[PDB]
Design a binder for this molecule. Structure first.
Ligand code: SAH
Ligand code: SAH
Ligand code: ZN
Ligand code: ZN
Ligand code: ZN
Ligand code: ZN
Ligand code: ZN
Ligand code: ZN
Lengths: 427, 428
């Protein structure tokens, strides 16, 4: 209402659109809106951090793109686009009679996909992917000191790495370390789900010393299992995401388990004065709470780096990485082995309409004039796992897909773990 | 139903009552029931930990005493007794025709207060307060190593104590340290509520250095504010208790703030090899979750000690204390200054119906001039062992000031806990 009055005042050329927050009509303009023209208040920044990468079961966005709220949204008909524009924002930026006439338009493209690009009150700002990448470096509200850079040990003095992996899953971290050719002295890995235990047991040939519950693990265990050189882990993102229909809480269950990672990180950290190279990685999903993200950034004492897997793989897997691994910030490079098109990951006899899959038009494959799910071995190919990685035991397809989806993106974790070759021995 | 068939088999003398779990009828009998005769399964132990000290707005118990569940409970008419027995348990242990006839009895006592104390299928075990005290030493499910005992520093080498207090409130901890006569070098205190800030500012004469929110305190702040010798804290129990009608969550809000205490504890802890005496106390309420209590015990790496203030003061203020303060286990001694009766804590011209008041239709506890009346604010200060007129600082309402008093630690309990710190730090 106040939004709409302010945009009415703007169309008279009495107020600049860049001096007003186009999301909620707030005068407290600190930022500029990254995609479109207007200002941006800080409450709308927190709402934009929480809500922008939230998608319904549909596959399309949970809320509007402009204000991250709205009442009734307008879904885009363009292929591979999932954006939604609520009716209240289109009443402003396009006009109060053009939303109703644009609903009647059956092939309707949204304004991020509009072939023309320019409109009367709304124009699309040009370097919007660059500003979307800079928008997460814009999160300087949590200001910290940079992670301590340790000087590289000489190549003759390097030793095999020792990894404490919490929330191991299907042993993605050890698989990536072997893919880099780093010698692994030992790989301690706590995990509870039997199927993921079994995947790692078979695929890594009994090298992994499997552990009980993380909460059961104490500091004495951490001391007696040798000094650790790399401590990795990722919080469960089954309840933390908006994709699960059963969102009874947000940081019941999953948050607890984060604090378990926090405690065993301190337990594995060498003392001050012990200048031996130690490293740690935490992972979480982007569709998360702001105060959640703050509390995580404060406890781990570090700024999160967002890394989307689209730059290197065929999925849309945007994940926050806290850590002190050198070159965590540096831009991602996709090797020729990595498949950037979904069609390359498909089996033979199958053709994909999509170029990317949003796993967080339900079934993404046209085969034999019929709509079908990605097969399990294809999902393995999509994240960059080796072929037939999860065919170990006699488990169902629904469970095995669910076992694959939770996992870290393999070229992303390769990109992250790659400078550790400078610090430890090679095969 | 099954448990009712089980009790039927017990009254035929085919099964012992001590081989069955009288709460829910489970055959997995690990423990014995502490108050009455029968076994006790572990799930019922967890339900007993959570539910036993939960009281309604009535003042009486939230659930049945026997099974911690039940459907419709029977409240006890005896004075100062707040127990409830659900109809389904009395169908067994007294008989299926005696519950109905015992409702009709208008002066009805319960079976922990029964003059006879010996009924047909239900008898009362004799050393039940001893077994209630031992029942919290029976919580060895969370087994840990004992807290490290540091050897005492000589009396000529002692220095004034430095306290980092989180969730200070009305500065109970510094007041108790001054009551003991310990020299305090500095008292940093984080606190958000203005009224509790103000109480501390006036009652402790600007000595307290006040911080903003606990979530704004970094490790850099902990390093630059001097080494700390004693870190204390207590989580909010407004939402965590069952007394608040608005229980939307359990460890939303309050749970966070616990971890803030956890982090700043690690930030204030000296390194390994730095053998200087460092101490810490955390406090929480007893009407809490089991897995909650587990997670807290695991993070703080210690076994809780339940301490009820009834042993030293006029309230029932049963609280868990985690810590490494020496003699945290040892039994409580009530000095002659402490008032064990409620009547002594009353003003003149007022006479109490109760001997103890616990506040987390006899809702108002005082019979004055043929009329029922709340405890006055200065009396609530006397009940917890605060000095007289402790909270009369600023122009604040009575409801707010009572609410400001009720959250606070019990002063002779905290005196009992802090007392061996005199052996480690300087005196006035
Ligand atoms: N208490 C607990 N201890 C260990 N693992 C747990 C756990 N609770 C859940 N998990 C498991 O931890 C995972 C959360 S996220 C797993 C991602 C992992 N990096 C991978 O690539 O597979 C799930 O597999 C979940 O089943
Ligand atoms: N984030 C926060 N930082 C500091 N204090 C807080 C807080 N949230 C709540 N509090 C306060 O902490 C107290 C919780 S319990 C206070 C008991 C205290 N030992 C005493 O004797 O007063 C309440 O006074 C509450 O208002
Ligand atoms: Zn706004
Ligand atoms: Zn909108
Ligand atoms: Zn579009
Ligand atoms: Zn039972
Ligand atoms: Zn009962
Ligand atoms: Zn009674």
């Amino acid at each position: 209402r106040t939004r709409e009055r302010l945009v009415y005042e703007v169309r008279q050329k009495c107020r600049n659109i860049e001096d007003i927050c186009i999301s909620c009509g707030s005068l407290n303009v600190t930022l500029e809106h990254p995609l479109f023209v207007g200002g941006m208040c800080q409450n709308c920044k927190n709402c934009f951090l929480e809500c922008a990468y939230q998608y319904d079961d549909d596959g399309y966005q949970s809320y509007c793109t402009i204000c991250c709220g709205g009442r009734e949204v307008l879904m885009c008909g363009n292929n591979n686009c999932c954006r939604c524009f609520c009716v209240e924002c289109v009443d402003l930026l396009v006009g109060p009679g053009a939303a109703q006439a644009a609903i009647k338009e059956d092939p309707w493209n949204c304004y991020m996909c509009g072939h023309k690009g320019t409109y009367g009150l709304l124009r699309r700002r040009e370097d919007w992917p660059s500003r979307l990448q800079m928008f997460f470096a814009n999160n300087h509200d949590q200001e910290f000191d940079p992670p301590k850079v340790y000087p590289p040990v000489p190549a003759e003095k390097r030793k095999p790495i020792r990894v404490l992996s919490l929330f191991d899953g299907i042993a993605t971290g050890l698989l990536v370390l072997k893919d880099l050719g780093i010698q692994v002295d030992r790989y301690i890995a706590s995990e509870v789900c039997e199927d993921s235990i079994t995947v790692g047991m078979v695929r890594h040939q009994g090298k992994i010393m499997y552990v009980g519950d993380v909460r059961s693990v104490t500091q004495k265990h951490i001391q007696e299992w040798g000094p650790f050189d790399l401590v990795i882990g990722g919080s469960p993102c089954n309840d933390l995401s908006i994709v699960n229909p059963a969102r009874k809480g947000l940081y019941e269950g999953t948050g607890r388990l984060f604090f378990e990672f926090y405690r065993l990180l301190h337990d594995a950290r060498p003392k001050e004065g012990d200048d031996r190279p130690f490293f740690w990685l935490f992972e979480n999903v982007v569709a998360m709470g702001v105060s959640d993200k703050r509390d995580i950034s404060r406890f781990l004492e570090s700024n999160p780096v967002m890394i989307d897997a689209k730059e290197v793989s065929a999925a849309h897997r945007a994940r926050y990485f806290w850590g002190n691994l050198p070159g965590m910030n540096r831009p991602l490079a996709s090797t020729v082995n990595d498949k950037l098109e979904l069609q390359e990951c498909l089996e033979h006899g199958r053709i994909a309409k999509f170029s990317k899959v949003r796993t967080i038009q339900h079934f993404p494959v046209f085969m034999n004039e019929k709509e079908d799910i990605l097969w399990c071995t294809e999902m393995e190919r999509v994240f960059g796992f080796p072929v037939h990685y999860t065919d170990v035991s006699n488990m169902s397809r629904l469970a095995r897909q669910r076992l694959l989806g939770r996992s870290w993106s393999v070229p992303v974790i390769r990109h992250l773990f790659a400078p550790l070759k400078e610090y430890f021995a090679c095969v």
